[PDB]
Design a protein around this ligand. Structure first.
Ligand SMILES: *C(=O)N1C[C@H](NOS(=O)(=O)O)CC[C@H]1C(N)=O
Ligand SMILES: NC(=O)[C@@H]1CC[C@@H]2CN1C(=O)N2OS(=O)(=O)O
Length: 251
């Protein structure tokens, strides 16, 4: 059933929530239900879905696929090269995913998000939050018009990885490959993606870790989310919290 749980010890004083769902036995474990139901920008967690869009549309084809780096200078060393899908995903390389999505027409993206029930499915601000001054390093998924709740993230993850969408199984497997995480515990498989943004209206972070976990037959889909007012709280910090929860309660 739906169990309300207390994972606050693992959050070590940071404000947030968590939801874990096992769809075989319909076990919903929820910490901070209000937050779990609140829609926010997905930030870089949207790269999970953008990857599948690019694969389905043929813009990319494998974890080796490239997007034609043009020499633009970036402060992240690893963005300055013709990187593969696998490396762009793990580096959260914004230029790679912006070029990818701008090869896809807006109607196709709208219909895919509608089919996935991806939050408000609002792509109206296609080029993103331009008032932050970052120009082409912006898009509808980065503190802009698209918003989704942690509950809805888990529901989307489950539909994708349980095979209930029309995405090709080959493409799902590419995603699984590039999302795998090493947590120094061979008895569980963890997959996920971080995201980091700052909600300027509410003066709160949107710090995310969303993904799935396999252990001994069972699979849990999960979303961990902070909304702290402390700007030091990032996606990577929230991934730490998620792994602590997994090791304590799901091992
Ligand atoms: C992903 O979450 N990223 C972090 C950061 N997001 O900030 S934004 O929502 O204001 O755009 C920049 C994009 C991306 C990254 N790691 O570059
Ligand atoms: N970012 C990760 O993947 C985290 C961080 C370090 C390793 C891998 N992993 C863990 O869970 N670790 O910690 S450890 O279990 O204490 O060795």
């Amino acid at each position: 059933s739906v169990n309300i749980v207390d994972y606050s010890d693992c959050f070590e004083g940071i404000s947030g929530g968590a939801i874990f769902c096992n769809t075989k036995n319909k076990e919903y474990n929820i910490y901070n239900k209000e937050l779990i139901e609140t829609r926010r920008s997905p930030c870089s967690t949207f790269k999970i879905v953008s990857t599948l869009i690019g694969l389905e549309k043929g813009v990319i084809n494998s974890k080796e696929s490239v997007m034609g780096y043009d020499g633009t200078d970036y402060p992240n060393k690893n963005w300055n090269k013709n990187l593969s899908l696998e490396e762009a995903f793990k580096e959260s390389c914004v230029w790679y995913y912006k070029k990818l999505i701008n090869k896809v027409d807006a109607k196709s993206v709208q219909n895919i998000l509608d089919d996935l029930k991806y939050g408000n499915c609002d792509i109206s601000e296609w080029e993103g939050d331009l008032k932050n001054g970052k120009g082409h390093l912006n898009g509808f998924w980065l503190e802009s018009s698209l918003q989704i709740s942690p509950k809805e993230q888990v529901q989307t993850m489950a539909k994708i990885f349980e095979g209930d969408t029309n995405f090709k199984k080959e493409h799902i497997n590419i995603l699984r490959d590039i999302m795998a995480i090493d947590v120094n515990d061979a008895n569980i498989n963890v997959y996920g993606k971080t995201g980091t943004g700052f909600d300027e209206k509410n003066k709160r972070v949107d710090a995310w870790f969303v993904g799935m976990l396999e252990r001994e037959g069972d699979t849990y889909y999960f979303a961990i989310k902070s909304d702290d007012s402390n700007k030091e709280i990032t996606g990577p910090k929230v991934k730490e919290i998620a792994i602590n929860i997994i090791k304590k309660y799901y091992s």
